[PDB]
Protein backbone atom coordinates (compact mmCIF):
# COMPACT_ATOMS: atom_id res chain seq x y z
CA UNK A 1 0.00 0.00 0.00
CA UNK A 2 1.18 3.60 0.15
CA UNK A 3 2.22 5.94 3.01
CA UNK A 4 -1.25 7.53 2.66
CA UNK A 5 -2.71 4.33 4.17
CA UNK A 6 0.21 2.24 5.55
CA UNK A 7 -1.00 -1.37 5.93
CA UNK A 8 -0.91 -2.80 9.46
CA UNK A 9 -0.72 -6.53 10.14
CA UNK A 10 -0.91 -8.06 13.61
CA UNK A 11 1.00 -11.32 13.90
CA UNK A 12 1.12 -13.58 16.94
CA UNK A 13 1.43 -17.24 17.95
CA UNK A 14 4.56 -17.73 15.84
CA UNK A 15 8.09 -18.99 16.20
CA UNK A 16 9.79 -16.01 14.58
CA UNK A 17 13.34 -16.53 13.33
CA UNK A 18 14.66 -13.00 12.88
CA UNK A 19 18.06 -14.31 11.78
CA UNK A 20 16.78 -15.08 8.28
CA UNK A 21 15.67 -11.45 8.04
CA UNK A 22 18.95 -10.09 9.38
CA UNK A 23 21.17 -12.34 7.25
CA UNK A 24 19.71 -11.68 3.79
CA UNK A 25 21.61 -8.82 2.15
CA UNK A 26 18.62 -7.67 0.06
CA UNK A 27 17.81 -4.86 2.48
CA UNK A 28 19.41 -1.43 2.25
CA UNK A 29 18.20 -0.18 5.66
CA UNK A 30 17.82 -2.53 8.63
CA UNK A 31 17.97 -0.52 11.86
CA UNK A 32 16.59 -1.48 15.28
CA UNK A 33 15.92 1.12 17.95
CA UNK A 34 14.78 -0.40 21.24
CA UNK A 35 16.54 -3.75 20.76
CA UNK A 36 19.60 -5.24 19.07
CA UNK A 37 19.10 -7.05 15.74
CA UNK A 38 21.48 -9.84 16.77
CA UNK A 39 19.53 -10.40 20.01
CA UNK A 40 15.98 -10.83 18.69
CA UNK A 41 16.03 -14.64 18.71
CA UNK A 42 16.19 -14.74 22.52
CA UNK A 43 13.38 -12.38 23.58
CA UNK A 44 9.64 -12.98 23.71
CA UNK A 45 6.93 -10.59 22.53
CA UNK A 46 3.20 -10.48 23.15
CA UNK A 47 2.27 -9.39 19.61
CA UNK A 48 4.20 -7.82 16.77
CA UNK A 49 2.88 -5.30 14.25
CA UNK A 50 4.21 -5.13 10.69
CA UNK A 51 3.52 -1.83 8.94
CA UNK A 52 4.12 -1.76 5.20
CA UNK A 53 4.18 0.99 2.60
CA UNK A 54 6.30 2.46 -0.22
CA UNK A 55 8.08 5.84 -0.27
CA UNK A 56 10.85 7.78 -1.97
CA UNK A 57 14.49 7.12 -1.21
CA UNK A 58 14.84 10.59 0.31
CA UNK A 59 12.63 10.20 3.39
CA UNK A 60 13.81 6.82 4.64
CA UNK A 61 15.33 8.92 7.43
CA UNK A 62 11.83 10.23 8.22
CA UNK A 63 10.86 6.82 9.61
CA UNK A 64 12.32 7.48 13.07
CA UNK A 65 10.98 8.14 16.58
CA UNK A 66 11.57 11.88 16.28
CA UNK A 67 12.87 13.22 12.96
CA UNK A 68 10.10 15.61 12.03
CA UNK A 69 9.48 15.90 8.31
CA UNK A 70 6.87 16.05 5.59
CA UNK A 71 5.93 12.37 5.55
CA UNK A 72 7.03 11.87 9.17
CA UNK A 73 4.55 14.60 10.20
CA UNK A 74 1.69 14.29 7.73
CA UNK A 75 1.71 10.58 6.82
CA UNK A 76 3.39 8.24 9.34
CA UNK A 77 4.44 9.14 12.89
CA UNK A 78 6.73 6.93 15.01
CA UNK A 79 6.37 7.31 18.79
CA UNK A 80 9.44 8.67 20.54
CA UNK A 81 9.55 5.68 22.90
CA UNK A 82 9.79 3.33 19.93
CA UNK A 83 10.96 -0.26 20.35
CA UNK A 84 11.24 -2.16 17.08
CA UNK A 85 13.02 -2.29 13.73
CA UNK A 86 12.81 -0.47 10.40
CA UNK A 87 13.46 -2.34 7.15
CA UNK A 88 13.73 -0.56 3.80
CA UNK A 89 14.86 -1.70 0.38
CA UNK A 90 14.92 -0.10 -3.04
CA UNK A 91 12.38 -1.88 -5.25
CA UNK A 92 12.72 0.07 -8.48
CA UNK A 93 12.09 -2.93 -10.74
CA UNK A 94 8.95 -3.85 -8.78
CA UNK A 95 7.52 -0.32 -8.76
CA UNK A 96 8.99 1.78 -11.61
CA UNK A 97 7.58 1.45 -15.12
CA UNK A 98 8.92 2.76 -18.42
CA UNK A 99 5.77 4.87 -18.63
CA UNK A 100 6.17 5.61 -14.93
CA UNK A 101 4.28 4.42 -11.86
CA UNK A 102 1.73 7.08 -10.91
CA UNK A 103 -0.71 5.05 -8.78
CA UNK A 104 1.37 5.57 -5.61
CA UNK A 105 0.03 8.57 -3.71
CA UNK A 106 0.87 10.43 -0.50
CA UNK A 107 -0.72 13.10 1.66
CA UNK A 108 -0.14 16.82 1.75
CA UNK A 109 -2.44 19.60 2.96
CA UNK A 110 -3.41 18.52 6.46
CA UNK A 111 -4.65 20.89 9.16
CA UNK A 112 -2.01 19.56 11.59
CA UNK A 113 0.53 16.84 12.28
CA UNK A 114 -0.23 13.25 13.29
CA UNK A 115 -0.38 11.23 16.47
CA UNK A 116 2.11 8.36 16.69
CA UNK A 117 0.58 5.45 14.75
CA UNK A 118 -2.40 7.43 13.48
CA UNK A 119 -4.06 6.64 10.15
CA UNK A 120 -5.18 9.28 7.63
CA UNK A 121 -7.52 8.12 4.86
CA UNK A 122 -9.41 11.42 4.55
CA UNK A 123 -9.32 12.88 1.02
CA UNK A 124 -10.89 16.32 1.38
CA UNK A 125 -10.19 19.48 -0.60
CA UNK A 126 -7.78 21.69 1.32
CA UNK A 127 -8.41 25.32 2.22
CA UNK A 128 -5.49 27.72 1.77
CA UNK A 129 -7.50 30.91 2.28
CA UNK A 130 -11.01 31.03 3.73
CA UNK A 131 -13.13 29.86 0.78
CA UNK A 132 -15.95 27.38 1.47
CA UNK A 133 -14.50 25.06 -1.16
CA UNK A 134 -17.14 22.42 -1.89
CA UNK A 135 -15.44 20.34 -4.56
CA UNK A 136 -13.65 23.28 -6.22
CA UNK A 137 -9.91 23.80 -6.68
CA UNK A 138 -9.42 27.50 -7.44
CA UNK A 139 -6.10 28.98 -6.30
CA UNK A 140 -6.87 28.33 -2.63
CA UNK A 141 -8.36 24.82 -2.77
CA UNK A 142 -5.99 21.87 -2.97
CA UNK A 143 -6.74 18.22 -3.27
CA UNK A 144 -4.66 16.84 -0.42
CA UNK A 145 -3.07 13.87 -2.17
CA UNK A 146 -0.22 14.03 -4.68
CA UNK A 147 1.47 11.14 -6.40
CA UNK A 148 4.88 9.88 -7.46
CA UNK A 149 6.18 9.44 -10.99
CA UNK A 150 8.63 6.59 -10.37
CA UNK A 151 10.55 6.50 -13.65
CA UNK A 152 13.28 3.83 -13.91
CA UNK A 153 15.81 6.49 -14.92
CA UNK A 154 15.06 8.69 -11.90
CA UNK A 155 17.64 9.57 -9.30
CA UNK A 156 18.12 7.39 -6.25
CA UNK A 157 16.03 9.73 -4.10
CA UNK A 158 12.92 9.56 -6.27
CA UNK A 159 13.04 5.78 -6.81
CA UNK A 160 10.56 3.54 -5.00
CA UNK A 161 11.59 2.04 -1.68
CA UNK A 162 9.44 -0.57 0.02
CA UNK A 163 9.45 -0.12 3.78
CA UNK A 164 8.21 -2.36 6.59
CA UNK A 165 8.51 -1.44 10.27
CA UNK A 166 8.13 -4.02 13.03
CA UNK A 167 6.81 -2.85 16.39
CA UNK A 168 7.14 -5.31 19.27
CA UNK A 169 4.91 -5.68 22.34
CA UNK A 170 7.63 -6.25 24.99
CA UNK A 171 4.70 -6.04 27.39
CA UNK A 172 5.19 -8.88 29.92
CA UNK A 173 1.57 -10.06 29.39
CA UNK A 174 1.73 -13.74 28.26
CA UNK A 175 3.86 -14.01 25.10
CA UNK A 176 2.87 -15.63 21.79
CA UNK A 177 5.67 -14.64 19.40
CA UNK A 178 8.84 -16.27 20.80
CA UNK A 179 12.19 -16.72 19.02
CA UNK A 180 13.71 -20.09 18.13
CA UNK A 181 15.09 -21.69 21.36
CA UNK A 182 14.99 -25.18 22.90
CA UNK A 183 13.01 -25.44 26.13
CA UNK A 184 14.53 -27.84 28.64
CA UNK A 185 12.99 -29.48 31.66
CA UNK A 186 13.23 -27.45 34.86
CA UNK A 187 15.32 -28.36 37.90
CA UNK A 188 14.15 -27.25 41.34
CA UNK A 189 15.94 -26.68 44.65
CA UNK A 190 19.22 -25.72 42.95
CA UNK A 191 20.72 -22.30 42.26
CA UNK A 192 20.41 -22.24 38.47
CA UNK A 193 20.10 -19.47 35.91
CA UNK A 194 16.79 -19.46 34.08
CA UNK A 195 15.15 -17.91 31.02
CA UNK A 196 11.35 -17.98 31.35
CA UNK A 197 10.32 -16.81 27.85
CA UNK A 198 12.59 -13.78 27.99
CA UNK A 199 12.55 -13.31 31.78
CA UNK A 200 16.20 -13.93 32.65
CA UNK A 201 17.57 -14.46 36.12
CA UNK A 202 19.48 -16.64 38.55
CA UNK A 203 18.16 -18.27 41.69
CA UNK A 204 16.56 -21.29 43.31
CA UNK A 205 13.14 -22.41 42.04
CA UNK A 206 10.56 -24.06 44.27
CA UNK A 207 6.88 -24.92 44.25
CA UNK A 208 4.76 -22.16 45.76
CA UNK A 209 1.50 -22.34 47.70
CA UNK A 210 0.41 -18.87 46.57
CA UNK A 211 -2.44 -18.97 44.06
CA UNK A 212 -2.09 -16.73 41.04
CA UNK A 213 -5.40 -15.65 39.66
CA UNK A 214 -5.76 -17.34 36.26
CA UNK A 215 -4.69 -14.18 34.41
CA UNK A 216 -1.37 -13.21 36.02
CA UNK A 217 1.85 -14.43 34.44
CA UNK A 218 4.46 -13.60 37.11
CA UNK A 219 4.76 -11.93 40.50
CA UNK A 220 6.97 -9.01 41.41
CA UNK A 221 8.51 -7.52 44.55
CA UNK A 222 8.96 -4.20 46.32
CA UNK A 223 12.10 -3.67 44.30
CA UNK A 224 11.56 -4.15 40.59
CA UNK A 225 12.45 -7.85 40.77
CA UNK A 226 10.47 -11.03 40.11
CA UNK A 227 9.78 -13.35 43.03
CA UNK A 228 7.14 -15.68 41.57
CA UNK A 229 6.72 -16.87 37.99
CA UNK A 230 4.25 -19.00 36.05
CA UNK A 231 5.83 -21.90 34.21
CA UNK A 232 4.81 -22.29 30.56
CA UNK A 233 3.92 -25.80 29.38
CA UNK A 234 2.65 -26.55 32.90
CA UNK A 235 0.78 -23.40 34.04
CA UNK A 236 2.42 -23.93 37.43
CA UNK A 237 3.54 -21.24 39.88
CA UNK A 238 7.14 -21.23 41.11
CA UNK A 239 8.73 -19.23 43.89
CA UNK A 240 12.14 -17.77 43.05
CA UNK A 241 14.70 -17.02 45.73
CA UNK A 242 18.28 -15.74 45.45
CA UNK A 243 20.83 -18.47 46.05
CA UNK A 244 22.64 -17.73 49.24
CA UNK A 245 25.27 -15.03 49.61
CA UNK A 246 27.15 -13.48 52.50
CA UNK A 247 30.32 -11.84 53.72
CA UNK A 248 33.56 -13.61 54.58
Amino acid at each position, epitope marked *: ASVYAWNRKRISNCVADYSVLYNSASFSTFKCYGVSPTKLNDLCFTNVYADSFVIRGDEVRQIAPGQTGKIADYNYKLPDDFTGCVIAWNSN*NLDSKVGGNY*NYLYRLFRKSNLKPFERDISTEIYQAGSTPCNGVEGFNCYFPLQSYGFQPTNGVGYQPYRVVVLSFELLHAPATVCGPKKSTNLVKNKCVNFNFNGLTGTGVLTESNKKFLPFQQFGRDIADTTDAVRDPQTLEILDITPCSFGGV
Partner: antibody
Amino acid sequence: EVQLVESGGGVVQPGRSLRLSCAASGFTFSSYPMHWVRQAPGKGLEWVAVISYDGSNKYYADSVKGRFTISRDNSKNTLYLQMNSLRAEDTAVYYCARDTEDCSSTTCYVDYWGQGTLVTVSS
Amino acid sequence: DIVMTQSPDSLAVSLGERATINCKSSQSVLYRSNNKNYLAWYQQKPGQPPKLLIYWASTRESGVPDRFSGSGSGTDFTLTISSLQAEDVAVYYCHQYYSTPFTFGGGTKVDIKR
Protein backbone atom coordinates in the same frame (compact mmCIF):
# COMPACT_ATOMS: atom_id res chain seq x y z
CA GLU B 1 -2.72 -5.07 -33.07
CA VAL B 2 -0.30 -7.77 -31.91
CA GLN B 3 0.50 -11.11 -33.57
CA LEU B 4 2.32 -13.91 -31.73
CA VAL B 5 3.79 -16.85 -33.65
CA GLU B 6 4.92 -19.73 -31.45
CA SER B 7 7.67 -22.14 -32.47
CA GLY B 8 8.12 -25.59 -30.96
CA GLY B 9 5.23 -27.89 -30.18
CA GLY B 10 4.16 -31.28 -31.41
CA VAL B 11 3.98 -34.68 -29.77
CA VAL B 12 6.40 -35.20 -26.88
CA GLN B 13 7.26 -38.22 -24.79
CA PRO B 14 7.20 -37.95 -20.98
CA GLY B 15 10.61 -37.56 -19.39
CA ARG B 16 11.91 -35.43 -22.27
CA SER B 17 12.85 -31.74 -22.08
CA LEU B 18 12.38 -29.22 -24.88
CA ARG B 19 11.29 -25.62 -25.33
CA LEU B 20 8.92 -23.22 -27.07
CA SER B 21 9.81 -19.81 -28.47
CA CYS B 22 7.09 -17.25 -29.18
CA ALA B 23 7.95 -14.39 -31.54
CA ALA B 24 5.94 -11.21 -30.98
CA SER B 25 5.09 -8.56 -33.57
CA GLY B 26 3.24 -5.27 -33.61
CA PHE B 27 4.62 -3.53 -30.51
CA THR B 28 7.68 -2.70 -28.42
CA PHE B 29 8.65 -6.09 -26.99
CA SER B 30 11.11 -5.03 -24.28
CA SER B 31 8.54 -3.03 -22.27
CA TYR B 32 5.74 -5.55 -21.67
CA PRO B 33 5.47 -8.48 -19.22
CA MET B 34 4.68 -11.89 -20.71
CA HIS B 35 2.32 -14.61 -19.47
CA TRP B 36 1.80 -18.29 -20.22
CA VAL B 37 -1.84 -19.34 -19.90
CA ARG B 38 -2.74 -23.01 -20.39
CA GLN B 39 -5.95 -23.73 -22.26
CA ALA B 40 -6.57 -27.41 -21.49
CA PRO B 41 -9.06 -29.43 -23.55
CA GLY B 42 -12.27 -29.38 -21.52
CA LYS B 43 -10.74 -27.70 -18.45
CA GLY B 44 -10.25 -24.02 -19.30
CA LEU B 45 -7.70 -21.47 -18.16
CA GLU B 46 -4.69 -22.21 -15.97
CA TRP B 47 -2.07 -19.56 -15.28
CA VAL B 48 1.53 -20.75 -15.56
CA ALA B 49 4.19 -18.06 -15.24
CA VAL B 50 5.11 -14.39 -15.69
CA ILE B 51 8.30 -12.57 -16.72
CA SER B 52 8.93 -8.88 -15.97
CA TYR B 53 8.92 -6.16 -18.70
CA ASP B 54 12.74 -6.24 -18.56
CA GLY B 55 12.47 -9.92 -17.49
CA SER B 56 13.84 -8.96 -14.03
CA ASN B 57 11.41 -11.08 -11.92
CA LYS B 58 10.15 -14.59 -12.65
CA TYR B 59 7.05 -16.17 -11.15
CA TYR B 60 5.95 -19.78 -11.69
CA ALA B 61 2.79 -21.67 -10.74
CA ASP B 62 2.29 -23.99 -7.74
CA SER B 63 1.92 -27.38 -9.45
CA VAL B 64 4.61 -26.37 -11.98
CA LYS B 65 7.45 -26.33 -9.43
CA GLY B 66 10.25 -28.60 -10.60
CA ARG B 67 9.02 -28.66 -14.20
CA PHE B 68 9.44 -25.45 -16.21
CA THR B 69 11.70 -22.47 -16.65
CA ILE B 70 10.74 -19.39 -18.67
CA SER B 71 13.17 -16.86 -20.16
CA ARG B 72 12.67 -13.99 -22.59
CA ASP B 73 14.84 -13.22 -25.63
CA ASN B 74 13.95 -9.56 -26.15
CA SER B 75 16.24 -9.27 -29.18
CA LYS B 76 14.10 -11.30 -31.59
CA ASN B 77 10.87 -10.44 -29.73
CA THR B 78 10.53 -13.92 -28.28
CA LEU B 79 9.45 -15.55 -25.04
CA TYR B 80 11.11 -18.91 -24.33
CA LEU B 81 9.54 -21.64 -22.21
CA GLN B 82 11.84 -24.60 -21.50
CA MET B 83 9.60 -27.43 -20.29
CA ASN B 84 11.11 -30.52 -18.64
CA SER B 85 9.87 -33.98 -17.59
CA LEU B 86 6.35 -33.54 -18.95
CA ARG B 87 3.40 -35.61 -17.71
CA ALA B 88 0.40 -36.93 -19.62
CA GLU B 89 -1.86 -34.27 -18.04
CA ASP B 90 0.09 -31.37 -19.64
CA THR B 91 -1.49 -31.42 -23.11
CA ALA B 92 -3.13 -28.06 -23.87
CA VAL B 93 -2.73 -24.94 -26.01
CA TYR B 94 -0.42 -22.69 -24.01
CA TYR B 95 -1.31 -19.18 -25.14
CA CYS B 96 1.40 -16.57 -24.75
CA ALA B 97 -0.03 -13.25 -23.61
CA ARG B 98 1.10 -9.62 -23.39
CA ASP B 99 0.33 -7.66 -20.24
CA THR B 100 -0.61 -4.02 -19.80
CA GLU B 101 1.53 -2.06 -17.35
CA ASP B 102 -1.43 -0.32 -15.73
CA CYS B 103 -1.70 -1.66 -12.16
CA SER B 104 0.29 -0.01 -9.36
CA SER B 105 2.85 -2.84 -9.34
CA THR B 106 4.77 -4.61 -12.12
CA THR B 107 1.94 -7.04 -12.86
CA CYS B 108 -1.67 -6.50 -13.86
CA TYR B 109 -4.47 -7.89 -16.01
CA VAL B 110 -3.79 -9.08 -19.55
CA ASP B 111 -5.26 -7.96 -22.89
CA TYR B 112 -3.51 -9.58 -25.88
CA TRP B 113 -3.39 -13.33 -26.51
CA GLY B 114 -1.10 -15.09 -28.95
CA GLN B 115 -1.96 -18.41 -30.54
CA GLY B 116 0.27 -20.93 -28.81
CA THR B 117 1.28 -24.41 -29.90
CA LEU B 118 -0.09 -27.83 -28.92
CA VAL B 119 2.78 -29.60 -27.16
CA THR B 120 1.34 -33.10 -26.91
CA VAL B 121 2.31 -35.34 -24.00
CA SER B 122 2.19 -39.08 -24.72
CA SER B 123 4.46 -42.14 -24.59
CA ASP C 1 -2.79 -18.55 -2.23
CA ILE C 2 -6.13 -17.07 -3.29
CA VAL C 3 -8.56 -19.87 -4.22
CA MET C 4 -11.68 -18.56 -5.94
CA THR C 5 -15.24 -19.90 -5.83
CA GLN C 6 -17.26 -18.84 -8.88
CA SER C 7 -21.00 -19.52 -8.96
CA PRO C 8 -22.98 -20.72 -10.71
CA ASP C 9 -21.15 -23.02 -13.13
CA SER C 10 -23.83 -24.33 -15.52
CA LEU C 11 -25.98 -21.34 -16.50
CA ALA C 12 -28.80 -22.59 -18.74
CA VAL C 13 -31.04 -19.53 -19.11
CA SER C 14 -33.17 -18.53 -22.09
CA LEU C 15 -32.46 -15.60 -24.38
CA GLY C 16 -32.97 -11.93 -23.58
CA GLU C 17 -33.18 -12.18 -19.80
CA ARG C 18 -30.69 -11.07 -17.16
CA ALA C 19 -28.11 -13.31 -15.52
CA THR C 20 -25.51 -12.95 -12.80
CA ILE C 21 -22.27 -14.73 -11.90
CA ASN C 22 -20.82 -14.12 -8.43
CA CYS C 23 -17.25 -14.70 -7.26
CA LYS C 24 -16.00 -15.32 -3.73
CA SER C 25 -12.30 -15.83 -3.03
CA SER C 26 -10.81 -16.71 0.34
CA GLN C 27 -8.86 -13.44 0.42
CA SER C 28 -10.35 -9.95 0.20
CA VAL C 29 -8.51 -9.04 -3.01
CA LEU C 30 -8.84 -5.21 -2.82
CA TYR C 31 -6.68 -2.07 -2.25
CA ARG C 32 -7.38 1.30 -0.59
CA SER C 33 -4.38 3.48 -1.56
CA ASN C 34 -6.11 3.26 -4.97
CA ASN C 35 -9.75 2.30 -4.29
CA LYS C 36 -9.45 -0.18 -7.15
CA ASN C 37 -10.46 -3.83 -6.72
CA TYR C 38 -7.72 -5.87 -8.38
CA LEU C 39 -9.92 -8.40 -10.18
CA ALA C 40 -11.19 -8.99 -13.72
CA TRP C 41 -14.02 -10.69 -15.60
CA TYR C 42 -13.19 -12.60 -18.81
CA GLN C 43 -15.23 -14.63 -21.29
CA GLN C 44 -14.38 -17.14 -24.01
CA LYS C 45 -16.14 -18.59 -27.01
CA PRO C 46 -14.99 -22.15 -27.80
CA GLY C 47 -12.10 -22.21 -30.25
CA GLN C 48 -10.56 -18.85 -29.30
CA PRO C 49 -8.43 -17.53 -26.46
CA PRO C 50 -10.69 -15.75 -23.94
CA LYS C 51 -11.57 -12.05 -24.08
CA LEU C 52 -11.31 -9.35 -21.42
CA LEU C 53 -14.65 -7.99 -20.23
CA ILE C 54 -14.26 -6.04 -16.98
CA TYR C 55 -11.19 -4.60 -15.25
CA TRP C 56 -11.11 -3.46 -11.61
CA ALA C 57 -14.06 -5.89 -11.32
CA SER C 58 -16.36 -2.90 -11.87
CA THR C 59 -15.25 -0.72 -14.77
CA ARG C 60 -16.15 -1.28 -18.44
CA GLU C 61 -13.58 -1.35 -21.23
CA SER C 62 -14.14 -0.35 -24.87
CA GLY C 63 -15.92 -2.72 -27.22
CA VAL C 64 -18.10 -3.92 -24.32
CA PRO C 65 -21.83 -3.15 -24.61
CA ASP C 66 -24.22 -3.26 -21.66
CA ARG C 67 -24.59 -6.99 -22.28
CA PHE C 68 -21.74 -7.11 -19.75
CA SER C 69 -21.49 -5.24 -16.46
CA GLY C 70 -18.91 -5.65 -13.70
CA SER C 71 -19.36 -4.86 -10.01
CA GLY C 72 -18.26 -6.00 -6.58
CA SER C 73 -16.07 -5.27 -3.58
CA GLY C 74 -14.81 -6.91 -0.41
CA THR C 75 -14.42 -10.48 -1.61
CA ASP C 76 -17.79 -10.77 -3.40
CA PHE C 77 -18.13 -9.76 -7.04
CA THR C 78 -20.85 -9.88 -9.69
CA LEU C 79 -20.85 -10.03 -13.47
CA THR C 80 -24.36 -9.07 -14.62
CA ILE C 81 -25.53 -9.59 -18.20
CA SER C 82 -28.64 -7.50 -18.85
CA SER C 83 -29.85 -9.03 -22.12
CA LEU C 84 -28.74 -12.21 -23.89
CA GLN C 85 -27.90 -12.58 -27.57
CA ALA C 86 -27.12 -15.49 -29.88
CA GLU C 87 -23.32 -15.07 -29.69
CA ASP C 88 -23.17 -15.47 -25.90
CA VAL C 89 -23.14 -19.26 -25.57
CA ALA C 90 -19.70 -19.03 -23.98
CA VAL C 91 -17.70 -19.82 -20.86
CA TYR C 92 -17.22 -16.99 -18.36
CA TYR C 93 -14.33 -16.72 -15.89
CA CYS C 94 -13.17 -14.56 -13.02
CA HIS C 95 -9.49 -13.84 -12.47
CA GLN C 96 -7.55 -12.22 -9.64
CA TYR C 97 -4.47 -10.07 -10.05
CA TYR C 98 -4.08 -8.77 -6.49
CA SER C 99 -1.13 -11.00 -5.53
CA THR C 100 0.82 -13.84 -7.10
CA PRO C 101 0.16 -16.64 -7.80
CA PHE C 102 -2.67 -15.60 -10.10
CA THR C 103 -5.81 -17.72 -10.22
CA PHE C 104 -8.80 -18.08 -12.56
CA GLY C 105 -12.43 -19.06 -12.06
CA GLY C 106 -13.93 -22.50 -12.40
CA GLY C 107 -15.78 -21.40 -15.51
CA THR C 108 -19.39 -20.70 -16.40
CA LYS C 109 -20.70 -22.38 -19.57
CA VAL C 110 -23.68 -20.12 -20.40
CA ASP C 111 -26.17 -21.20 -23.11
CA ILE C 112 -29.57 -19.80 -24.19
CA LYS C 113 -31.86 -22.37 -22.53
CA ARG C 114 -34.20 -23.94 -25.12
